């Protein structure tokens, strides 16, 4: 399986928001995630669309279709936006429920995070986020971890971390 992303829309101009959704493929029996994502502070600023504010350090994104069972979920954010850091997750906590629903997560979106553009994005683009380790994640996969609902951890060999694309200037 994978993880992968979509960018809603590529070419921004400063003041615009651009949102990154994540989603999960072919991940058999998807309990839950945790992500480090990097990004670049000169050009973005995660921004919370339902308050209408910047994040702070204990923001979660917002939420995708995966994960919304009612099987105790359970959310972490905890960020350091002064390195252009996201550290984030959300996990079923009662993988016994969950599994006698009999519906099985795979594919879909998990999160979706929005930027604010404030500055003017260089002509040869910049790459919109990466996933990579960092935080205190042991055994991550590019800056992921995914569970299944038996509470296996997925390892390397079990799915790739596609990065995300770029975005462009006006």
């Given at each position: 399986?994978?993880?992968?992303?979509?960018?809603?829309?590529?070419?921004?101009?400063?003041?615009?928001?651009?949102?990154?959704?994540?989603?999960?493929?072919?991940?058999?029996?998807?309990?839950?995630?945790?992500?480090?994502?990097k990004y670049?502070?000169?050009?973005?600023?995660?921004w919370d669309?339902?308050?209408?504010?910047?994040?702070?350090?204990?923001?979660?994104?917002?939420?995708?279709?995966?994960?919304?069972?009612?099987?105790?979920?359970?959310?972490?954010?905890?960020?350091?936006?002064?390195?252009?850091?996201?550290?984030?997750?959300?996990?079923?906590?009662?993988?016994?429920?969950?599994?006698?629903?009999?519906?099985?997560?795979?594919?879909?979106?998990?999160?979706?995070?929005?930027?604010?553009?404030?500055?003017?994005?260089?002509?040869?683009?910049?790459?919109?986020?990466?996933?990579?380790?960092?935080?205190s994640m042991?055994?991550?996969?590019?800056?992921?971890?995914?569970?299944?609902?038996?509470?296996?951890?997925?390892?390397?060999?079990?799915?790739?971390?596609?990065?995300?694309?770029?975005?462009?200037?006006?």
């Open positions: 399986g994978s993880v992968l992303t979509a960018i809603d829309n590529d070419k921004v101009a400063v003041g615009d928001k651009v949102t990154l959704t994540i989603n999960v493929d072919k991940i058999t029996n998807f309990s839950g995630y945790q992500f480090n994502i670049n502070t000169t050009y973005l600023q995660p669309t339902i308050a209408d504010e910047a994040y702070t350090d204990s923001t979660m994104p917002d939420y995708g279709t995966l994960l919304q069972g009612r099987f105790n979920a359970t959310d972490m954010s905890k960020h350091n936006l002064s390195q252009g850091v996201l550290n984030f997750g959300r996990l079923y906590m009662n993988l016994s429920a969950y599994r006698a629903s009999g519906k099985p997560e795979s594919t879909g979106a998990v999160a979706k995070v929005t930027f604010k553009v404030i500055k003017e994005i260089p002509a040869e683009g910049i790459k919109l986020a990466t996933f990579e380790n960092g935080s042991n055994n991550a996969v590019d800056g992921t971890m995914l569970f299944d609902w038996d509470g296996n951890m997925y390892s390397s060999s079990a799915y790739k971390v596609v990065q995300p694309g770029l975005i462009y200037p006006k």
